[PDB]
């Protein structure tokens, strides 16, 4: 999945008129997501991680 571009995205669109471009049919990497020590908080609700 090309989620890295969104991860390092320079700009984000508005909440009311964000451009709709569906991206699917892939398996994500989550390689860099394993290092969560740099994030101030980490919350999960409704299911244990």
């Amino acid at each position: 999945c090309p989620f890295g571009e969104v991860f390092n995205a320079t700009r984000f669109a508005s909440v009311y008129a964000w451009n709709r471009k569906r991206i699917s049919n892939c398996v994500a990497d989550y390689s860099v997501l394993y290092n969560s020590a740099s994030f101030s908080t980490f919350k999960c609700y409704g299911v244990s991680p």
Partner: antibody, heavy 119, light 110 residues
Framework: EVQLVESGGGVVQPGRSLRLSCAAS????????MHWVRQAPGKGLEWVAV????????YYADSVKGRFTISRDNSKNTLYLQMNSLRAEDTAVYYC??????????????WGQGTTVTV | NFMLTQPHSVSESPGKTVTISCTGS????????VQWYQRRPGSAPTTVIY?????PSGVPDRFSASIDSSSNSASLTISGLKTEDEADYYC?????????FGGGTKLTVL
């Protein structure tokens, strides 16, 4: 079934060169990482460092960066931690243990027994 | 940054049901092993409970450790209180690599 014993030398003069090992086996060590935790007396648990599997990005604490250098080899499933210029504040039991689950560190189940080190 | 919420003042008569409340965050309370640390002034600190499965001789059976997910809270009741054991309870938690001290808890037993 689950027996892990730590062994090493006794009285070691500070500044000497010696290598230690805490071999982890019996499972898939390829996907399992080795973590080291130091427990300061009176205070809570202290984070030390973390290493990514890819190795592109490595993060270290400000109090351990520069002086220490770690080396690991997935082929032999053994981690080597060369201790140079031992500090007085580092005189504590060293826990050789693997993190909870797969790629999880925020959770802790079993503490480290500790290794016999003298500073 | 981190916000700690505790009651301003609360007390209950002995012999009734008491429940000390300390909110847990920065993760799942069912995934955190809550281990209490005490440092009695005038004495040298020594570990009393570690590894969550080792019992030194003389450890009382009254203390029990578990997590209750029915009401998202933990219940602990301590009997056999001793006069020299009267002190202040402080609940401490750590997130990443930051340490935050509490505002100060004062409790008086009437």
């Amino acid at each position: 079934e689950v027996q892990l014993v730590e062994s090493g030398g006794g009285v070691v003069q500070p500044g000497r060169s010696l290598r230690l090992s805490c071999a982890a086996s019996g499972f898939t060590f390829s996907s399992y990482g080795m973590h080291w935790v130091r427990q300061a007396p009176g205070k809570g648990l202290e984070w030390v460092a973390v290493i990514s599997y890819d190795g592109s990005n490595k993060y270290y604490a400000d109090s351990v960066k520069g002086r220490f250098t770690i080396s690991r080899d997935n082929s032999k499933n053994t981690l080597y931690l060369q201790m140079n210029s031992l500090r007085a504040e580092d005189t504590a039991v060293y826990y050789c243990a693997n993190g909870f689950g797969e790629y999880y560190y925020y959770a802790m189940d079993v503490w480290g027994q500790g290794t016999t080190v003298t500073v | 940054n981190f916000m700690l919420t505790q009651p301003h003042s609360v007390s209950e008569s002995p012999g009734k049901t008491v429940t000390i409340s300390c909110t847990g965050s920065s993760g799942s309370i069912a995934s955190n092993y809550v281990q209490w640390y005490q440092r009695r002034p005038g004495s040298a600190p020594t570990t009393v409970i570690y590894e969550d499965n080792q019992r030194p001789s003389g450890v009382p059976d009254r203390f029990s450790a578990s997590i209750d997910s029915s009401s998202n809270s933990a219940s602990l009741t301590i009997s056999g209180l001793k006069t020299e054991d009267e002190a202040d309870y402080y609940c401490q938690s750590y997130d990443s690599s930051n340490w935050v001290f509490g505002g100060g808890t004062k409790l008086t037993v009437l």
